[PDB]
Amino acid sequence: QQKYDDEDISEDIKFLLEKLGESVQDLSSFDEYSSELKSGRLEWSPVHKSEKFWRENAVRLNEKNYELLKILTKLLEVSDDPQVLAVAAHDVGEYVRHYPRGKRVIEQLGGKQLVMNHMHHEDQQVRYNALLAVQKLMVHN
Amino acid sequence: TEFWLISAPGEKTCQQTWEKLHAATTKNNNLAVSSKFNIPDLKVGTLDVLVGLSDELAKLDAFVEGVVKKVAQYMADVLEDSKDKVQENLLASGVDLVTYITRFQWDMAKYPIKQSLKNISEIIAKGVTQIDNDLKSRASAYNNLKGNLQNLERKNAGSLLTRSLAEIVKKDDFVLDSEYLVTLLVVVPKLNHNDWIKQYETLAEMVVPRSSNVLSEDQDSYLCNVTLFRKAVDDFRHKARENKFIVRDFQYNEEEMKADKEEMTRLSTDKKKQFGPLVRWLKVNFSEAFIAWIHIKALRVFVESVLRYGLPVNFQAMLLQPNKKSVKKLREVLHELYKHLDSSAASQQEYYPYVYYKIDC
Amino acid sequence: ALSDADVQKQIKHMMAFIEQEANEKAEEIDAKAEEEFNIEKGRLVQTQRLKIMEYY
Amino acid sequence: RGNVFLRQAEIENPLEDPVTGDYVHKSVFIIFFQGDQLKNRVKKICEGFRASLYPCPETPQERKEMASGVNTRIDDLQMVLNQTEDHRQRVLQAAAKN
């Protein structure tokens, strides 16, 4: 945004924008992300918020009979750490935004009531992310 | 020619008298013309579809009325023996139109009622299309003859400058086998006729002396011609257009002049021979379309009656040719005699307790 | 503009007309029956005629 | 030819109207025809002038049973709304303090 008469500084800035952008694109993936899902410790890999992740490869989250959604449902039922719950609930919301049949499937899972019960977790942030998931399910409901 | 067609559910046999004249249910104390209607019996088949069938029947009836009014309009525009002002009392099949609705007959030979009313209406629609194309084609032919005749008339009308010169200028009025001499038909008004007869030779270079001849005249000017040199025609025009003179370049021949009068006369004669059968066709077409129009109206009336009255096929219907302005009193009286049909309530609008349609000119 | 009784009257009229439509559809089904049977009778007769003629 | 049975009821203690917000008492006057084109025309005039024709009533009471399940779902939705209005009041206070 600022302008400099030294082409060295501007050139280094542009080079960094470029390389760091390539790295950001490298972070975009679904196999590494799903291994991170399976590991049981949901690190905040930046793909959780990527719009390209929720449009170009949202259908990837529907693995064999919604395999990975079921894995995340199990890890939601078992673990109640704030950040795993946040990651899984947010990712489920971003997926179920685009798939109404995915919404009905998630309702069939029973995980909707599991989130409705996560609404009473001791930390209010967890209650709020469950709230956000519910208002992602409220559409036409 | 107003006619009110009214029907009722008809729960009592003796109401046939009400259809004809009966005093206790008469119209305007036996002063309004009341007649019993020819009610035919037809097959309904289905009540569900009949909603759409009646809707399309109404639209088609509007179309057929359009056809009848168009054909009547052209018959009036025949401008001979038939007009909206004179001879408006035409004949439906040899008897007058009002006499035919008062004599309203009905048949199934030409339209077997055992067939569904949809097919009957489509058949009459096909006949309607045929008669429409017939009228349009024959009227296009009549309009061709008429336009050409009238344009020929207007071509013939005028003065020598602006009219055909078949009968006026002849071969004796033109130089024969001229080597270098053109005889211009220099029409010159009376305002400048003597100027021309005393300047004819000096009006162009190399003009034949004493070639001052006079041929004919007209309402605006006196035709005359002078003989001069071929290249001197342009000089003559230059020196003569400003003198109020004018040149009438015309070529004379025997059949070149007679053929146009022959064509106009033949056009009139064959146009005559063809308005004959044309008007016979117009009469039969109008009678056919008129009877078919009232026929489909009777079909629509029976349809709507069956919708509004119930399962059995018994009802009443009856013509009216109402008395002058008494139809309002009749509106109130028939309101009294038909409100109890519904027995409960009855703006009315076209939502009457009776099934009504109108017939007119 | 109808009472309870008159509403029942026309409802029974729709019912009787449903019965008339039942008669009509039954007539159509009977017509299909008659023609279809004549068709199958002729078809089987002719086919078996061909077979027996061949063997004979 | 209105000739079908009337199912009528009066609803009092209304709620705010969908399209005007009016807290106006209601009353249903129900007449149904089995004609299909008639049903279409009735739907046209009823929707155009005034009507609310969402449901599909039918003989199976299983529809009513699933509707009871829907009414329990509906209860859960109102407690969702209650939480959210509490939260928005509190966050608005928090922002207003500074």
XYZ file of C-alpha atoms in Angstrom:
656
model
C 0.000 0.000 0.000
C 2.860 2.350 0.836
C 5.143 3.382 -2.034
C 8.943 3.341 -1.814
C 11.570 4.756 -4.184
C 13.919 1.872 -3.306
C 13.215 -0.901 -5.802
C 15.015 -3.353 -3.497
C 12.383 -3.103 -0.758
C 9.461 -3.240 -3.186
C 11.054 -6.158 -5.043
C 11.536 -8.085 -1.795
C 7.944 -7.312 -0.800
C 6.610 -8.578 -4.130
C 8.778 -11.699 -3.950
C 7.442 -12.410 -0.466
C 3.833 -11.905 -1.551
C 4.479 -14.385 -4.351
C 6.274 -17.118 -2.375
C 3.992 -16.870 0.656
C 1.025 -17.097 -1.706
C 2.446 -20.291 -3.185
C 2.799 -21.682 0.329
C -0.799 -20.702 1.135
C -1.831 -22.617 -1.979
C 0.263 -25.565 -0.781
C -1.744 -25.586 2.451
C -4.851 -26.097 0.293
C -5.369 -29.872 0.221
C -7.784 -32.509 1.465
C -5.694 -35.636 2.071
C -3.349 -33.878 4.493
C -6.341 -32.102 6.009
C -8.183 -35.407 6.465
C -5.157 -37.058 8.041
C -5.177 -34.085 10.413
C -8.861 -34.813 11.042
C -8.081 -38.460 11.773
C -5.136 -37.723 14.089
C -7.545 -36.698 16.862
C -5.786 -33.353 17.476
C -7.380 -30.783 15.160
C -4.616 -28.290 14.502
C -5.826 -25.048 12.924
C -4.613 -25.693 9.409
C -5.773 -22.587 7.511
C -7.927 -24.574 5.062
C -10.722 -24.571 7.673
C -11.801 -21.119 6.418
C -10.697 -21.305 2.778
C -13.507 -20.449 0.366
C -11.760 -22.553 -2.280
C -11.961 -25.401 0.233
C -15.740 -25.046 0.663
C -16.509 -24.656 -3.061
C -13.949 -26.566 -5.142
C -13.690 -29.572 -2.793
C -16.663 -29.429 -0.424
C -17.940 -32.726 -1.839
C -14.665 -34.347 -0.773
C -15.841 -34.185 2.850
C -18.565 -36.661 1.812
C -16.261 -39.679 1.709
C -17.552 -43.289 1.808
C -21.105 -42.982 3.190
C -20.017 -39.635 4.634
C -17.039 -41.354 6.256
C -15.108 -38.317 7.476
C -18.228 -36.539 8.730
C -18.945 -39.660 10.784
C -15.369 -39.687 12.097
C -15.723 -36.050 13.133
C -19.090 -36.835 14.719
C -17.419 -39.574 16.754
C -14.604 -37.243 17.804
C -17.199 -34.621 18.734
C -19.010 -37.168 20.897
C -15.809 -38.397 22.545
C -13.617 -35.291 22.865
C -14.957 -31.969 24.161
C -11.785 -29.874 23.977
C -12.817 -26.356 22.859
C -10.728 -26.199 19.687
C -11.452 -29.657 18.249
C -15.144 -28.928 18.814
C -14.774 -25.539 17.121
C -12.878 -26.937 14.125
C -15.282 -29.816 13.538
C -18.471 -27.808 14.072
C -17.296 -24.977 11.825
C -16.220 -27.374 9.072
C -19.553 -29.190 9.297
C -21.349 -25.861 9.018
C -19.343 -24.786 5.983
C -20.027 -28.119 4.284
C -23.728 -28.297 5.162
C -24.215 -24.762 3.850
C -23.914 -26.078 0.269
C -25.602 -29.511 0.708
C -29.209 -29.541 1.988
C -29.258 -33.313 1.525
C -26.069 -33.264 3.567
C -28.128 -31.436 6.183
C -30.771 -34.160 6.209
C -28.024 -36.798 6.457
C -26.445 -34.980 9.407
C -29.893 -34.904 11.000
C -30.127 -38.664 10.412
C -26.765 -39.098 12.161
C -28.174 -37.745 15.407
C -25.223 -35.358 15.583
C -27.643 -32.438 15.407
C -28.782 -33.324 18.926
C -25.177 -33.892 19.976
C -24.436 -30.297 18.946
C -27.656 -29.156 20.627
C -26.219 -30.748 23.781
C -22.778 -29.243 23.164
C -24.717 -25.970 23.462
C -24.380 -26.504 27.249
C -20.589 -26.822 27.450
C -18.852 -25.014 30.295
C -17.037 -22.614 27.946
C -19.297 -20.064 26.265
C -17.238 -20.095 23.054
C -18.152 -23.762 22.564
C -21.805 -22.911 23.172
C -21.477 -20.147 20.570
C -19.927 -22.358 17.891
C -22.681 -24.916 18.481
C -25.121 -22.019 18.139
C -23.566 -21.101 14.787
C -23.854 -24.717 13.621
C -27.540 -24.754 14.584
C -28.235 -21.542 12.662
C -26.501 -23.137 9.726
C -29.025 -25.964 10.078
C -32.025 -23.667 10.661
C -32.414 -22.846 6.956
C -35.773 -24.255 5.806
C -36.041 -26.075 9.147
C -82.392 -6.252 -32.490
C -82.242 -7.164 -28.807
C -83.089 -10.687 -27.658
C -82.893 -11.925 -24.056
C -82.324 -15.684 -23.664
C -83.121 -16.900 -20.139
C -83.138 -20.371 -18.580
C -84.090 -21.745 -15.162
C -83.548 -25.043 -13.305
C -87.039 -26.209 -14.234
C -88.367 -28.213 -11.295
C -91.987 -28.200 -12.534
C -93.481 -29.423 -15.807
C -96.086 -26.654 -16.123
C -93.371 -23.999 -16.535
C -93.499 -24.773 -20.258
C -96.390 -22.329 -20.230
C -94.072 -19.822 -18.524
C -91.775 -20.331 -21.500
C -94.542 -19.486 -23.971
C -96.821 -16.781 -22.485
C -98.299 -17.789 -19.088
C -99.927 -14.802 -17.413
C -98.755 -15.459 -13.845
C -95.108 -15.451 -15.013
C -95.487 -13.344 -18.153
C -93.204 -10.499 -19.236
C -94.643 -6.983 -18.921
C -98.299 -8.032 -18.698
C -98.262 -9.808 -22.067
C -96.739 -6.803 -23.843
C -93.140 -7.985 -24.146
C -92.745 -10.698 -26.765
C -92.211 -14.009 -24.954
C -91.717 -17.271 -26.850
C -90.729 -20.780 -25.838
C -87.208 -21.800 -26.820
C -86.354 -24.842 -28.915
C -84.479 -26.904 -26.313
C -82.502 -29.851 -27.739
C -81.213 -32.835 -25.790
C -77.482 -33.560 -25.969
C -74.872 -35.673 -24.203
C -72.627 -34.121 -21.552
C -70.244 -37.002 -20.856
C -68.043 -35.333 -18.233
C -68.554 -32.351 -15.929
C -64.882 -31.857 -15.069
C -63.545 -31.217 -18.576
C -66.692 -29.267 -19.467
C -65.323 -26.263 -17.564
C -62.487 -25.913 -20.077
C -64.725 -26.932 -22.970
C -67.171 -24.140 -22.105
C -64.340 -21.630 -21.683
C -62.946 -22.405 -25.129
C -66.513 -22.456 -26.440
C -67.019 -18.904 -25.211
C -63.760 -17.732 -26.782
C -64.605 -19.497 -30.051
C -68.107 -18.021 -30.011
C -66.574 -14.571 -29.666
C -64.393 -15.427 -32.657
C -67.339 -16.652 -34.731
C -69.282 -13.517 -33.874
C -66.230 -11.649 -35.150
C -66.519 -13.627 -38.378
C -70.227 -12.842 -38.721
C -69.785 -9.110 -38.108
C -66.871 -8.953 -40.561
C -68.847 -10.693 -43.319
C -71.845 -8.461 -42.609
C -69.535 -5.429 -42.776
C -68.278 -6.419 -46.208
C -71.809 -7.176 -47.429
C -72.763 -3.672 -46.335
C -69.668 -2.311 -48.109
C -70.792 -4.006 -51.335
C -72.383 -0.553 -51.889
C -75.113 -2.115 -54.060
C -78.361 -3.711 -52.806
C -76.994 -4.198 -49.266
C -75.926 -1.652 -46.645
C -76.061 -1.065 -42.916
C -78.488 1.786 -43.696
C -80.622 0.265 -46.493
C -81.562 -3.376 -47.129
C -80.337 -4.251 -43.632
C -83.283 -6.697 -43.483
C -81.422 -9.571 -45.101
C -82.647 -13.176 -45.276
C -81.463 -16.116 -43.179
C -82.199 -19.017 -45.556
C -84.982 -17.199 -47.397
C -86.752 -15.788 -44.327
C -85.752 -12.729 -42.317
C -83.281 -12.950 -39.439
C -85.710 -11.947 -36.687
C -88.263 -14.232 -38.319
C -85.646 -16.987 -38.142
C -84.871 -16.617 -34.436
C -88.620 -16.565 -33.820
C -88.651 -19.598 -36.158
C -85.563 -21.100 -34.521
C -85.321 -24.639 -35.854
C -82.734 -27.255 -34.965
C -81.334 -30.464 -36.482
C -78.811 -33.252 -35.959
C -78.507 -34.454 -39.567
C -75.856 -31.872 -40.454
C -74.355 -32.270 -36.953
C -75.041 -35.666 -35.332
C -75.428 -34.840 -31.646
C -74.392 -38.377 -30.706
C -70.872 -37.054 -31.234
C -69.445 -34.975 -28.408
C -70.085 -31.239 -28.391
C -66.333 -30.636 -28.699
C -66.235 -32.344 -32.093
C -69.373 -30.495 -33.206
C -67.847 -27.153 -32.244
C -64.597 -28.055 -34.011
C -66.528 -29.007 -37.157
C -68.359 -25.687 -37.127
C -64.993 -24.011 -36.503
C -63.589 -25.712 -39.601
C -66.538 -24.423 -41.598
C -65.914 -20.995 -40.089
C -62.281 -21.081 -41.211
C -63.330 -22.154 -44.700
C -65.866 -19.346 -45.062
C -63.380 -16.818 -43.682
C -60.697 -17.762 -46.203
C -63.382 -17.752 -48.908
C -64.504 -14.225 -48.030
C -60.933 -12.967 -47.726
C -59.882 -14.396 -51.100
C -62.958 -13.297 -53.038
C -62.905 -9.864 -51.383
C -59.226 -9.521 -52.291
C -60.213 -10.206 -55.903
C -63.054 -7.674 -55.689
C -60.686 -5.111 -54.179
C -58.171 -5.701 -56.975
C -60.832 -5.075 -59.619
C -62.186 -2.075 -57.694
C -58.811 -0.440 -57.128
C -57.701 -0.921 -60.721
C -61.049 0.390 -61.994
C -60.912 3.499 -59.826
C -57.252 4.193 -60.625
C -58.112 3.884 -64.319
C -60.966 6.351 -63.797
C -58.657 8.851 -62.095
C -56.022 8.363 -64.803
C -58.642 9.204 -67.428
C -59.811 12.300 -65.535
C -58.103 15.667 -65.876
C -56.919 17.885 -68.717
C -54.835 17.091 -71.786
C -51.586 17.512 -69.854
C -52.747 15.142 -67.082
C -55.042 12.733 -68.962
C -54.826 10.006 -71.573
C -55.204 11.313 -75.129
C -56.799 8.320 -76.840
C -59.694 10.101 -78.560
C -58.135 13.572 -78.902
C -54.904 13.544 -80.936
C -54.777 11.568 -84.186
C -52.293 10.653 -86.912
C -53.323 13.602 -89.091
C -52.154 15.868 -86.231
C -48.579 14.500 -86.391
C -45.844 14.817 -88.999
C -45.438 11.620 -91.036
C -42.072 10.072 -91.964
C -40.301 13.125 -90.574
C -36.613 13.249 -91.470
C -35.432 15.807 -88.897
C -38.714 17.322 -87.676
C -40.479 16.671 -84.356
C -44.048 17.941 -83.968
C -44.318 18.870 -80.289
C -47.818 18.906 -78.780
C -47.226 22.327 -77.247
C -50.297 22.956 -75.098
C -50.606 26.694 -74.409
C -53.186 28.354 -72.109
C -55.633 30.985 -73.283
C -53.526 33.443 -71.274
C -50.741 32.968 -73.852
C -52.341 31.311 -76.911
C -51.858 34.289 -79.229
C -48.305 34.694 -77.947
C -47.639 31.125 -79.079
C -49.382 31.527 -82.429
C -47.244 34.628 -83.100
C -43.970 33.236 -81.660
C -44.137 29.527 -82.670
C -41.285 29.916 -85.176
C -38.967 32.046 -83.031
C -39.558 29.885 -79.931
C -36.723 27.638 -81.131
C -33.978 27.669 -83.716
C -34.598 26.041 -87.099
C -38.403 25.924 -86.849
C -40.652 25.215 -89.838
C -42.224 28.572 -90.822
C -46.012 28.855 -90.656
C -46.290 25.591 -88.708
C -48.858 27.146 -86.347
C -51.658 24.595 -85.973
C -54.368 24.167 -83.306
C -55.784 20.755 -82.360
C -57.961 20.660 -79.220
C -58.477 22.222 -75.786
C -59.569 21.598 -72.203
C -60.615 23.415 -69.028
C -57.155 24.931 -68.365
C -55.588 25.386 -71.793
C -55.800 25.122 -75.575
C -53.774 22.333 -77.192
C -51.665 23.264 -80.210
C -48.583 21.920 -81.981
C -45.609 23.250 -83.944
C -43.030 21.466 -86.111
C -39.341 22.187 -85.485
C -35.850 20.662 -85.604
C -34.871 17.599 -83.557
C -32.117 19.299 -81.575
C -34.374 22.359 -81.305
C -36.792 20.507 -78.995
C -34.523 21.277 -76.039
C -34.202 24.918 -77.105
C -37.979 25.084 -77.490
C -38.480 23.692 -73.998
C -35.980 26.193 -72.596
C -37.629 29.181 -74.274
C -41.206 27.919 -73.802
C -41.481 26.614 -70.229
C -41.160 30.219 -69.004
C -43.939 31.468 -71.347
C -46.531 29.264 -69.569
C -46.251 26.856 -72.499
C -45.953 23.113 -71.925
C -44.974 20.116 -74.069
C -47.074 16.922 -74.188
C -44.834 14.137 -75.477
C -47.329 11.481 -76.609
C -47.082 8.571 -79.057
C -50.112 7.697 -81.192
C -51.187 4.259 -82.395
C -54.447 2.494 -83.179
C -54.597 -0.284 -80.571
C -52.245 1.412 -78.092
C -55.135 3.828 -77.440
C -58.105 1.466 -77.808
C -56.713 -1.353 -75.663
C -56.934 0.698 -72.462
C -60.634 1.475 -72.991
C -61.143 -2.179 -73.919
C -59.452 -3.174 -70.663
C -61.521 -0.812 -68.516
C -64.757 -1.943 -70.184
C -63.805 -5.621 -69.898
C -62.845 -5.045 -66.277
C -66.298 -3.626 -65.598
C -68.078 -6.395 -67.520
C -66.256 -9.302 -65.903
C -66.427 -7.596 -62.506
C -70.155 -7.517 -63.197
C -70.371 -11.199 -64.120
C -68.515 -11.915 -60.892
C -70.427 -9.774 -58.390
C -73.334 -11.954 -59.418
C -72.082 -15.292 -58.066
C -70.128 -13.373 -55.425
C -73.299 -11.965 -53.881
C -74.999 -15.341 -54.096
C -72.003 -16.736 -52.200
C -72.156 -13.865 -49.710
C -75.828 -14.497 -48.993
C -75.389 -18.232 -48.468
C -72.217 -17.715 -46.406
C -73.913 -15.172 -44.149
C -76.994 -17.346 -43.667
C -74.840 -20.393 -42.907
C -72.546 -18.577 -40.479
C -75.490 -16.845 -38.797
C -77.409 -20.071 -38.229
C -74.218 -21.764 -37.023
C -73.541 -18.851 -34.669
C -76.961 -19.134 -33.055
C -76.457 -22.906 -33.009
C -73.246 -22.685 -30.996
C -74.972 -20.138 -28.765
C -77.727 -22.662 -28.068
C -75.043 -25.249 -27.337
C -73.312 -22.883 -24.907
C -76.643 -22.057 -23.257
C -77.474 -25.729 -22.757
C -73.932 -26.355 -21.504
C -74.035 -23.631 -18.864
C -77.566 -24.669 -17.896
C -76.405 -28.236 -17.238
C -73.521 -26.861 -15.180
C -75.787 -24.588 -13.143
C -78.814 -26.887 -12.674
C -77.668 -30.429 -11.921
C -77.547 -34.031 -13.033
C -80.931 -34.469 -14.812
C -81.343 -33.007 -18.279
C -84.706 -31.307 -17.608
C -84.899 -27.518 -17.489
C -86.696 -24.520 -18.983
C -85.513 -21.968 -21.528
C -87.365 -19.291 -23.439
C -86.705 -16.467 -25.888
C -87.497 -12.799 -25.295
C -87.764 -9.887 -27.667
C -88.312 -7.393 -24.846
C -90.581 -4.382 -24.788
C -88.963 -0.958 -25.019
C -87.155 -0.151 -21.730
C -89.453 -2.437 -19.716
C -86.610 -4.937 -19.339
C -85.615 -3.106 -16.145
C -88.980 -3.736 -14.525
C -88.496 -7.265 -15.826
C -85.080 -7.409 -14.175
C -86.817 -6.744 -10.863
C -89.730 -9.119 -11.521
C -87.525 -11.976 -12.744
C -85.358 -11.259 -9.703
C -88.471 -11.990 -7.659
C -89.231 -15.149 -9.678
C -85.633 -16.464 -9.625
C -84.192 -15.495 -6.230
C -86.072 -18.398 -4.619
C -84.212 -20.790 -6.927
C -81.195 -20.302 -4.658
C -83.447 -19.610 -1.625
C -80.610 -18.111 0.469
C -79.091 -14.832 -0.813
C -79.502 -14.166 -4.535
C -73.223 -7.105 -6.545
C -74.967 -9.471 -8.951
C -72.961 -8.613 -12.091
C -73.147 -11.571 -14.490
C -73.647 -13.752 -11.372
C -77.379 -14.099 -11.877
C -79.665 -16.824 -10.500
C -80.466 -17.607 -14.165
C -78.403 -18.573 -17.215
C -78.382 -15.652 -19.650
C -76.881 -14.761 -23.013
C -77.621 -12.077 -25.607
C -78.348 -12.175 -29.348
C -78.132 -9.067 -31.542
C -77.524 -7.747 -35.057
C -76.413 -19.173 -1.909
C -77.354 -22.726 -0.935
C -78.536 -24.359 2.283
C -77.108 -27.518 3.816
C -79.779 -29.511 1.984
C -79.021 -27.967 -1.412
C -75.283 -28.432 -0.925
C -76.020 -32.087 -0.191
C -78.224 -32.219 -3.298
C -75.446 -31.087 -5.595
C -72.893 -33.237 -3.743
C -75.064 -36.251 -4.460
C -75.243 -34.987 -8.046
C -71.438 -35.055 -8.257
C -71.544 -38.526 -6.727
C -74.073 -39.790 -9.267
C -71.996 -38.218 -12.018
C -68.922 -40.007 -10.676
C -71.045 -43.133 -11.049
C -71.899 -42.126 -14.619
C -68.181 -41.655 -15.280
C -67.699 -45.105 -13.743
C -70.161 -46.440 -16.305
C -68.285 -44.593 -19.059
C -64.804 -45.796 -18.086
C -66.241 -49.297 -17.645
C -67.628 -49.093 -21.173
C -64.221 -47.989 -22.461
C -62.551 -50.850 -20.593
C -65.108 -53.290 -22.025
C -64.417 -51.986 -25.539
C -60.685 -52.430 -25.007
C -61.431 -55.937 -23.714
C -63.490 -56.985 -26.712
C -61.100 -55.618 -29.322
C -57.945 -56.801 -27.521
C -59.377 -60.309 -27.134
C -60.319 -60.481 -30.789
C -56.766 -59.338 -31.539
C -55.085 -61.998 -29.392
C -57.418 -64.708 -30.697
C -56.587 -63.830 -34.298
C -52.868 -63.495 -33.572
C -52.502 -66.850 -31.826
C -54.716 -68.602 -34.373
C -52.665 -67.290 -37.297
C -49.281 -68.010 -35.701
C -50.205 -71.583 -34.862
C -51.663 -71.954 -38.356
C -48.252 -71.032 -39.758
C -46.467 -73.530 -37.512
C -48.765 -76.445 -38.348
C -48.622 -75.600 -42.063
C -44.823 -75.685 -41.940
C -44.611 -79.026 -40.139
C -47.293 -80.531 -42.382
C -71.151 -23.321 -8.453
C -69.993 -23.507 -4.853
C -71.412 -26.879 -3.903
C -68.796 -28.556 -1.670
C -68.652 -29.005 2.090
C -67.595 -26.163 4.386
C -64.980 -26.698 7.097
C -65.002 -23.507 9.165
C -63.255 -22.458 12.360
C -62.535 -19.252 14.264
C -59.002 -18.546 15.495
C -58.654 -15.975 18.264
C -55.561 -14.832 20.130
C -53.757 -14.216 16.817
C -50.096 -13.523 16.052
C -48.359 -10.908 13.928
C -49.248 -11.370 10.287
C -46.645 -12.670 7.796
C -46.981 -9.899 5.211
C -48.251 -6.897 7.225
C -47.290 -7.601 10.851
C -50.933 -7.164 11.861
C -51.876 -8.940 15.099
C -55.286 -9.702 13.615
C -57.761 -12.457 14.462
C -58.419 -15.014 11.744
C -61.145 -17.324 10.467
C -60.899 -20.106 7.881
C -63.684 -20.850 5.382
C -62.719 -23.994 3.491
C -64.422 -25.228 0.330
C -62.535 -27.711 -1.874
C -63.222 -28.977 -5.398
C -61.623 -32.078 -6.910
C -61.603 -30.531 -10.379
C -57.983 -29.986 -11.375
C -58.330 -26.940 -13.635
C -60.878 -25.632 -11.131
C -58.306 -26.166 -8.393
C -55.744 -24.249 -10.461
C -58.059 -21.286 -11.067
C -59.073 -21.240 -7.397
C -55.406 -21.285 -6.411
C -54.753 -18.387 -8.800
C -57.495 -16.113 -7.461
C -56.914 -17.137 -3.832
C -53.170 -16.478 -3.962
C -53.621 -13.287 -5.975
C -56.180 -11.694 -3.662
C -55.734 -13.272 -0.209
C -54.831 -16.797 0.933
C -52.335 -19.077 2.686
C -52.267 -22.426 0.868
C -49.124 -24.122 2.192
C -50.362 -27.474 3.532
C -51.539 -30.693 1.899
C -54.338 -32.052 4.112
C -55.252 -35.683 3.595
C -56.948 -38.659 5.228
C -53.787 -40.251 6.777
C -53.479 -39.045 10.359
C -49.784 -39.946 10.061
C -49.493 -36.459 8.584
C -50.811 -35.089 11.872
C -48.388 -37.287 13.833
C -45.396 -36.025 11.857
C -46.864 -32.560 12.430
C -46.702 -33.196 16.181
C -43.045 -34.076 15.729
C -42.798 -30.785 13.859
C -44.355 -28.946 16.817
C -41.695 -30.330 19.158
C -39.043 -29.272 16.631
C -40.735 -25.853 16.593
C -40.396 -25.640 20.386
C -36.655 -26.269 20.050
C -36.458 -23.467 17.495
C -38.002 -20.954 19.906
C -35.505 -21.782 22.638
C -32.785 -21.226 20.001
C -34.210 -17.751 19.351
C -34.321 -17.040 23.094
C -30.631 -17.835 23.544
C -29.649 -15.701 20.585
C -31.584 -12.620 21.712
C -29.953 -12.907 25.141
C -26.525 -13.021 23.501
C -27.137 -10.051 21.208
C -28.353 -7.913 24.117
C -25.227 -8.723 26.111
C -22.762 -8.095 23.272
C -24.477 -4.785 22.500
C -24.038 -3.750 26.137
C -20.377 -4.782 25.988
C -19.684 -2.692 22.882
C -21.629 0.275 24.287
C -19.520 0.393 27.444
C -16.546 1.750 25.423
